[PDB]
Amino acid sequence: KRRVVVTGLGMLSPVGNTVESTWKALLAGQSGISLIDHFDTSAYATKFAGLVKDFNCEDIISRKEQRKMDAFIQYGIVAGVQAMQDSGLEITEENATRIGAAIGSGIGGLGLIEENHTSLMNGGPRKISPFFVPSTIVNMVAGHLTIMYGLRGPSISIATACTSGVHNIGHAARIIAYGDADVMVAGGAEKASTPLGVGGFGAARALSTRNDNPQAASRPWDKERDGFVLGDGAGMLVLEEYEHAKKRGAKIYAELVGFGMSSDAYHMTSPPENGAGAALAMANALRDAGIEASQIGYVNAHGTSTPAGDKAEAQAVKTIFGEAASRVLVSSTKSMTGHLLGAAGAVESIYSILALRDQAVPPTINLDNPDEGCDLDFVPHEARQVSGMEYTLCNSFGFGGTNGSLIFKKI
Amino acid sequence: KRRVVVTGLGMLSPVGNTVESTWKALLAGQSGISLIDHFDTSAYATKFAGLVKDFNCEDIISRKEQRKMDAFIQYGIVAGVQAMQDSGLEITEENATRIGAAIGSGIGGLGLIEENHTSLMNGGPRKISPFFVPSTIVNMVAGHLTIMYGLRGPSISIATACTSGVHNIGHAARIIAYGDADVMVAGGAEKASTPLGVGGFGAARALSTRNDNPQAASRPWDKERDGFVLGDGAGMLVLEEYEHAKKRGAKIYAELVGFGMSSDAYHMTSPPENGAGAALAMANALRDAGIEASQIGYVNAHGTSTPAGDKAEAQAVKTIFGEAASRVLVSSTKSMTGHLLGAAGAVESIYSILALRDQAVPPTINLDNPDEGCDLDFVPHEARQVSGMEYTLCNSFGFGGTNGSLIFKKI
Ligand SMILES: *[C@H](C(N)=O)[C@H](O)C(=O)CC/C=C/C/C=C/C
Ligand SMILES: *[C@H](C(N)=O)[C@H](O)C(=O)CC/C=C/C/C=C/C
């Protein structure tokens, strides 16, 4: 039996450009939400997002190579490098073959698609960049990373909307467990804060519209929720087989011990009031890990600050935790960070891992007045200190009722 | 140990709207390539593609529901229904939970992205459809199918460019083998024959330009190759665990016995002249199945009719088959059908499965003059009759050097 452990972390996010900085900002209840200034938002109903601030990549990616790449790929690589550096792995010819990648995105290169389409509308097909395809398609984050580090193992990319993050980590472990790889770089990257991504979610009426107080917009479970808050970023994990990691003397952050997937079979964008799909994915993760709900100390919720969405997950937690529902800690870091779509599950896996390290649970800021029936401990305003927390659960749900959960364990 | 078998086939393609029709057209060496007429191609360097002809879906999808869906999703569903109908599975409340889906696409809804972006350019963000997001994102084929049949098992979507098809089948089996599901609907759907998809690949100089003879454009391994030929379509497979399938008395088409993944670590679009990545993926598939190259009767090649691409794969076959390289049959059905990108690996899995059933190997049409060093039996012009063929191998390679292979076995 092969046990997968997390030996390397890397990340870009709205509250920080590194893992540790981001983690301090979350624990200090800082927000990363801000007014969008890279495109005219006058006609838009949402004028704010969680944007990655003062991002440098020149040291890692050259200006000549920057032009073949949408910003989502740029983020993915930089965060991937971080994860590799943190891992300390040395890739040798005797190694290459056993190391792979499992990185996805919800929609990939929206920025460059809009740009190319604009050129085509204004100049015909001869003005379309020669890199249009490889600069936008979702799997190019893993493509460039494999090339960069000479990785020859398995190379997949799962694109399941907001569950992407969780699914890539899940299958990266599965791959390792199966024997196809020893080390896997996994995570997700997203950069949808573009006209079409902001407009598009606006069109569906899914985004918050609180432009008078951008940092208060995102309020999971609060009575005044009006929609999720969009955020860009990327979170990369290095997963590797225990023994392999043991022999090399690797920083072991945690052990990936459970992975559950489920389908809703209800609505294309809406979740069931019930939360049954969310319930069956936690449930399945539990079975896969072989533990009971009661051993879960902290649940990093999907909790996107949407009226219907937050209700459902809460209910699913009450179904799964039952009597231990009052003793379990459930927060949403999306109150600060915003929804990272394809990257959400990746960064939130890092937050659930660090919580094990530090026994501190990031808060759910802006939760001034819980709505009617939410009696759970949502870690309301300030980080909570804890003791003896062995496991944490991490949720992510997505359009098409595609659900996933990851269980982490302290080692 | 769990053995996965294929109990249901479904498919839309340029040469046919059903599985059997398509199969007859391939064996009769028919081409599906034609002049594009849904957009002005006057300024374009390629004016032809493999398009799905006279496609009906009204019986399956209503006109009110058609509007929330890009054509790639439309194709996926219709082909998925076919696969379910062919399977004969009955979904019950005692069943739902164990049946899932694993359907991907290379780029998903290009058609609707261009349309929405056009509206936004000409009318601002209020003219963007409310279904923009769910009508384009890659995972909505599995989303709608799960809802339609009430599937509650695992729901993933792999988006690895032209390897998508193979990867979704691969992981669908892995999932089943692992125990997360008993039945999985898997495959891919693509519909990139749009201005941006044709222009975009044109921009890279990757497409054939033989507009004077569209049906002769696609010529894998021929000396006059000038680029791949674009094709739309979808191919769906129903994978299910042997025992489960046995007990229900299911039509067993074949057994999925091997799945190999590999990374090139060379170039973002170009393959290595060597074909080493392609070699290591066949190699890995072989190990996973536990058989030797010599037992492989037919290889459905990636063979996209690209100068560099076709060279490399051929070499990789010579490395893997070695002495049996002359006795093994290698054809490319892309000579007729064109490249289905995200769907390519799905339809070609069906062609490798049917070849087992009928012991007939589809030809590589248009191969008038093999280039210099290609001495392999490429099944040059007419279908070849065979006897005692137990296994077939199926290849698919993609941008970012992401490789995959599937091995099928006659039962
Ligand atoms: C996210 C959610 N409901 O939690 C949802 O599944 C989703 O739409 C992700 C797909 C988005 C990809 C980025 C595209 C932006 C236009
Ligand atoms: C396909 C190949 N080289 O065999 C290649 O990997 C690829 O570009 C697939 C990605 C395309 C998705 C459809 C987008 C069209 C614009």
Tab-separated table of C-alpha atoms in Angstrom, chain A residues 27-274:
chain	number	residue	atom	x	y	z
A	27	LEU	CA	-4.809	34.392	10.201
A	28	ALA	CA	-4.800	38.172	10.707
A	29	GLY	CA	-8.163	38.387	8.907
A	30	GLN	CA	-6.852	40.571	6.066
A	31	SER	CA	-8.864	40.946	2.850
A	32	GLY	CA	-7.407	40.841	-0.671
A	33	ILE	CA	-10.432	42.306	-2.428
A	34	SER	CA	-9.968	45.474	-4.442
A	35	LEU	CA	-11.243	47.639	-7.254
A	36	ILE	CA	-10.423	46.370	-10.725
A	37	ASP	CA	-8.384	48.940	-12.666
A	38	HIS	CA	-7.105	47.028	-15.713
A	39	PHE	CA	-10.328	47.479	-17.708
A	40	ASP	CA	-13.125	50.073	-17.693
A	41	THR	CA	-15.765	48.771	-15.261
A	42	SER	CA	-18.257	51.631	-15.666
A	43	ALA	CA	-20.868	49.461	-17.385
A	44	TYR	CA	-20.229	46.510	-15.042
A	45	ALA	CA	-22.328	45.500	-12.033
A	46	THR	CA	-19.253	44.268	-10.167
A	47	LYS	CA	-16.198	46.515	-10.135
A	48	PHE	CA	-14.029	44.513	-7.764
A	49	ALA	CA	-12.148	41.247	-7.383
A	50	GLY	CA	-9.379	39.431	-5.538
A	51	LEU	CA	-6.353	40.312	-7.702
A	52	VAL	CA	-2.719	39.187	-7.393
A	53	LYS	CA	-0.780	42.343	-6.490
A	54	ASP	CA	2.662	43.380	-7.694
A	55	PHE	CA	3.432	40.067	-9.366
A	56	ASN	CA	6.963	39.520	-10.643
A	57	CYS	CA	7.997	36.579	-12.823
A	58	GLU	CA	10.940	37.989	-14.785
A	59	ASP	CA	13.421	36.036	-12.653
A	60	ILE	CA	11.554	32.820	-13.533
A	61	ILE	CA	10.028	33.573	-16.941
A	62	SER	CA	11.731	35.754	-19.560
A	63	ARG	CA	9.924	38.584	-21.377
A	64	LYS	CA	10.350	36.734	-24.682
A	65	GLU	CA	8.698	33.681	-23.096
A	66	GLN	CA	6.008	35.728	-21.338
A	67	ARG	CA	4.342	36.469	-24.689
A	68	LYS	CA	3.492	32.803	-25.356
A	69	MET	CA	1.568	32.585	-22.112
A	70	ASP	CA	-1.739	33.673	-20.638
A	71	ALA	CA	-1.508	35.058	-17.089
A	72	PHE	CA	-3.103	31.886	-15.668
A	73	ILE	CA	-0.130	29.856	-16.952
A	74	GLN	CA	2.244	32.520	-15.626
A	75	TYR	CA	0.766	32.163	-12.133
A	76	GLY	CA	0.811	28.354	-12.298
A	77	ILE	CA	4.502	28.165	-13.239
A	78	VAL	CA	5.692	30.681	-10.625
A	79	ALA	CA	3.725	28.843	-7.920
A	80	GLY	CA	4.975	25.510	-9.294
A	81	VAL	CA	8.587	26.668	-9.042
A	82	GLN	CA	7.944	27.661	-5.425
A	83	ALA	CA	6.586	24.169	-4.729
A	84	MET	CA	9.601	22.514	-6.356
A	85	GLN	CA	12.030	24.757	-4.489
A	86	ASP	CA	10.235	24.064	-1.218
A	87	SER	CA	10.310	20.339	-2.033
A	88	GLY	CA	14.077	20.277	-2.553
A	89	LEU	CA	13.750	17.376	-5.011
A	90	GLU	CA	16.668	16.800	-7.354
A	91	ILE	CA	15.640	15.534	-10.781
A	92	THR	CA	18.084	13.080	-12.322
A	93	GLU	CA	17.974	10.936	-15.482
A	94	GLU	CA	17.281	8.058	-13.087
A	95	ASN	CA	14.397	10.128	-11.691
A	96	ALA	CA	12.648	12.012	-14.511
A	97	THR	CA	10.382	9.085	-15.476
A	98	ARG	CA	8.769	8.777	-12.033
A	99	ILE	CA	7.865	12.450	-11.484
A	100	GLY	CA	4.745	13.904	-13.136
A	101	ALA	CA	2.216	16.743	-12.925
A	102	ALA	CA	-1.530	17.133	-12.359
A	103	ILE	CA	-2.461	20.777	-12.772
A	104	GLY	CA	-5.780	22.160	-14.002
A	105	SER	CA	-7.799	25.355	-14.385
A	106	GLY	CA	-11.541	26.077	-14.640
A	107	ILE	CA	-11.430	28.000	-17.955
A	108	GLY	CA	-7.736	28.691	-18.598
A	109	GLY	CA	-6.644	31.576	-20.767
A	110	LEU	CA	-9.628	33.907	-21.021
A	111	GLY	CA	-7.324	36.933	-21.316
A	112	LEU	CA	-5.583	35.751	-24.480
A	113	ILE	CA	-8.777	34.378	-26.016
A	114	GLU	CA	-10.422	37.800	-25.772
A	115	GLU	CA	-7.301	39.487	-27.149
A	116	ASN	CA	-6.976	37.133	-30.118
A	117	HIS	CA	-10.692	37.327	-30.906
A	118	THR	CA	-10.462	41.138	-30.826
A	119	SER	CA	-7.564	41.063	-33.297
A	120	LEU	CA	-9.535	38.689	-35.517
A	121	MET	CA	-12.590	40.942	-35.382
A	122	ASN	CA	-10.489	43.967	-36.308
A	123	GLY	CA	-7.855	42.532	-38.658
A	124	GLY	CA	-8.989	39.112	-39.909
A	125	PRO	CA	-7.290	35.762	-39.259
A	126	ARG	CA	-3.752	36.971	-40.087
A	127	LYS	CA	-3.665	39.013	-36.888
A	128	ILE	CA	-4.216	35.964	-34.670
A	129	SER	CA	-1.088	35.144	-32.650
A	130	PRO	CA	0.761	31.967	-33.599
A	131	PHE	CA	0.699	31.041	-29.891
A	132	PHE	CA	-3.076	31.440	-29.510
A	133	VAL	CA	-3.670	27.734	-28.860
A	134	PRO	CA	-0.764	26.782	-26.544
A	135	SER	CA	-1.054	30.040	-24.633
A	136	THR	CA	-4.673	29.436	-23.616
A	137	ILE	CA	-5.460	25.732	-23.357
A	138	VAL	CA	-5.861	24.518	-19.801
A	139	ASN	CA	-3.094	21.882	-19.758
A	140	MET	CA	-0.176	24.194	-20.583
A	141	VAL	CA	0.658	24.856	-16.919
A	142	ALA	CA	1.686	21.210	-16.538
A	143	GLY	CA	3.217	21.306	-20.026
A	144	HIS	CA	5.647	24.115	-19.248
A	145	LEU	CA	6.464	22.758	-15.782
A	146	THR	CA	7.280	19.277	-17.076
A	147	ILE	CA	9.590	20.761	-19.737
A	148	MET	CA	11.206	23.186	-17.268
A	149	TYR	CA	12.133	20.454	-14.745
A	150	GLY	CA	12.431	17.623	-17.269
A	151	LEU	CA	9.475	15.668	-15.857
A	152	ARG	CA	8.648	12.503	-17.813
A	153	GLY	CA	6.021	10.897	-15.575
A	154	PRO	CA	2.255	11.176	-16.004
A	155	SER	CA	0.878	14.513	-17.163
A	156	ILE	CA	-2.853	15.129	-16.656
A	157	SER	CA	-5.074	18.185	-16.210
A	158	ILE	CA	-8.586	18.010	-14.725
A	159	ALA	CA	-10.972	20.809	-15.662
A	160	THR	CA	-14.024	20.543	-13.412
A	161	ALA	CA	-14.890	24.195	-12.823
A	162	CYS	CA	-14.468	25.082	-9.137
A	163	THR	CA	-13.699	21.478	-8.189
A	164	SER	CA	-10.603	21.461	-10.406
A	165	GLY	CA	-8.269	22.237	-7.505
A	166	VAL	CA	-9.460	19.296	-5.418
A	167	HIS	CA	-9.676	16.835	-8.310
A	168	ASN	CA	-6.073	17.430	-9.486
A	169	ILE	CA	-4.721	16.769	-5.979
A	170	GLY	CA	-7.015	13.749	-5.624
A	171	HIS	CA	-5.907	12.025	-8.841
A	172	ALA	CA	-2.287	13.007	-8.366
A	173	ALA	CA	-2.320	10.925	-5.156
A	174	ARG	CA	-4.289	8.130	-6.813
A	175	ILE	CA	-1.720	8.023	-9.617
A	176	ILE	CA	1.090	7.806	-7.036
A	177	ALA	CA	-0.735	5.178	-4.974
A	178	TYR	CA	-1.303	3.132	-8.139
A	179	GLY	CA	2.422	3.066	-8.970
A	180	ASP	CA	2.498	5.212	-12.126
A	181	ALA	CA	4.490	7.910	-10.333
A	182	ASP	CA	6.481	8.566	-7.164
A	183	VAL	CA	6.253	12.356	-7.139
A	184	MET	CA	3.440	14.495	-8.588
A	185	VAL	CA	3.200	18.300	-8.819
A	186	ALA	CA	-0.492	19.128	-8.363
A	187	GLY	CA	-2.808	22.094	-8.071
A	188	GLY	CA	-4.690	24.644	-10.127
A	189	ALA	CA	-4.291	28.146	-11.523
A	190	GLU	CA	-6.947	30.658	-12.554
A	191	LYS	CA	-7.134	34.205	-13.868
A	192	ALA	CA	-10.708	34.947	-14.889
A	193	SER	CA	-10.827	38.589	-13.726
A	194	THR	CA	-11.384	39.720	-17.320
A	195	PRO	CA	-14.286	41.442	-19.073
A	196	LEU	CA	-15.820	38.133	-20.230
A	197	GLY	CA	-15.290	36.398	-16.887
A	198	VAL	CA	-16.661	39.311	-14.856
A	199	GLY	CA	-19.404	40.112	-17.357
A	200	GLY	CA	-20.243	36.412	-17.808
A	201	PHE	CA	-20.768	35.621	-14.121
A	202	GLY	CA	-22.608	38.961	-13.833
A	203	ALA	CA	-24.907	37.822	-16.629
A	204	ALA	CA	-25.880	34.806	-14.484
A	205	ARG	CA	-26.407	37.066	-11.453
A	206	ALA	CA	-23.926	35.019	-9.446
A	207	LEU	CA	-21.616	37.775	-8.243
A	208	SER	CA	-21.881	40.133	-5.287
A	209	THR	CA	-22.610	43.761	-6.200
A	210	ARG	CA	-21.474	45.481	-3.021
A	211	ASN	CA	-19.195	48.020	-4.728
A	212	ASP	CA	-19.530	50.532	-1.853
A	213	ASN	CA	-17.611	48.193	0.466
A	214	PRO	CA	-15.543	45.755	-1.602
A	215	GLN	CA	-13.842	44.119	1.389
A	216	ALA	CA	-17.220	43.365	3.009
A	217	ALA	CA	-18.803	41.934	-0.131
A	218	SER	CA	-17.735	38.348	0.537
A	219	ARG	CA	-19.667	37.123	3.583
A	220	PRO	CA	-20.218	33.370	3.716
A	221	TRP	CA	-23.349	32.422	5.669
A	222	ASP	CA	-24.202	36.018	6.559
A	223	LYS	CA	-27.819	37.102	6.109
A	224	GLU	CA	-26.778	39.778	3.611
A	225	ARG	CA	-24.947	37.494	1.146
A	226	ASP	CA	-25.537	38.508	-2.493
A	227	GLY	CA	-23.096	36.379	-4.518
A	228	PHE	CA	-19.518	35.087	-4.572
A	229	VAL	CA	-16.497	37.337	-5.050
A	230	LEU	CA	-14.128	36.564	-7.927
A	231	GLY	CA	-10.425	36.060	-7.194
A	232	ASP	CA	-7.299	35.164	-9.190
A	233	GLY	CA	-4.346	33.043	-8.117
A	234	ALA	CA	-2.661	29.653	-7.987
A	235	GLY	CA	-1.722	27.062	-5.403
A	236	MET	CA	0.658	24.188	-6.086
A	237	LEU	CA	1.355	21.113	-3.963
A	238	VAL	CA	4.132	18.516	-4.308
A	239	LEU	CA	2.765	15.055	-3.531
A	240	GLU	CA	5.144	12.122	-3.110
A	241	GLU	CA	5.119	8.559	-1.837
A	242	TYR	CA	6.014	8.239	1.838
A	243	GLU	CA	8.987	5.863	1.557
A	244	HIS	CA	10.427	7.861	-1.355
A	245	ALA	CA	10.045	11.019	0.742
A	246	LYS	CA	11.386	9.273	3.860
A	247	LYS	CA	14.608	8.075	2.203
A	248	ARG	CA	15.394	11.548	0.817
A	249	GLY	CA	14.711	13.258	4.157
A	250	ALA	CA	11.909	15.511	2.960
A	251	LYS	CA	10.025	18.185	4.864
A	252	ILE	CA	6.740	16.289	5.405
A	253	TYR	CA	3.872	18.771	5.766
A	254	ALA	CA	1.093	16.196	5.982
A	255	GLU	CA	-0.339	12.967	4.622
A	256	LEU	CA	-3.085	12.785	1.991
A	257	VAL	CA	-5.318	10.100	3.514
A	258	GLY	CA	-8.735	10.480	1.880
A	259	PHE	CA	-10.282	11.559	-1.427
A	260	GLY	CA	-13.979	11.536	-2.286
A	261	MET	CA	-15.872	12.418	-5.449
A	262	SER	CA	-19.626	12.691	-6.000
A	263	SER	CA	-22.245	13.947	-8.454
A	264	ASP	CA	-25.347	15.997	-7.668
A	265	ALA	CA	-27.600	15.103	-10.590
A	266	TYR	CA	-29.808	18.110	-9.886
A	267	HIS	CA	-29.080	21.386	-11.641
A	268	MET	CA	-26.389	22.721	-13.974
A	269	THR	CA	-25.352	25.607	-11.709
A	270	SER	CA	-27.521	25.262	-8.615
A	271	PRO	CA	-26.893	22.863	-5.746
A	272	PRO	CA	-29.649	20.886	-4.044
A	273	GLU	CA	-31.063	22.649	-0.947
A	274	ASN	CA	-30.318	19.349	0.769
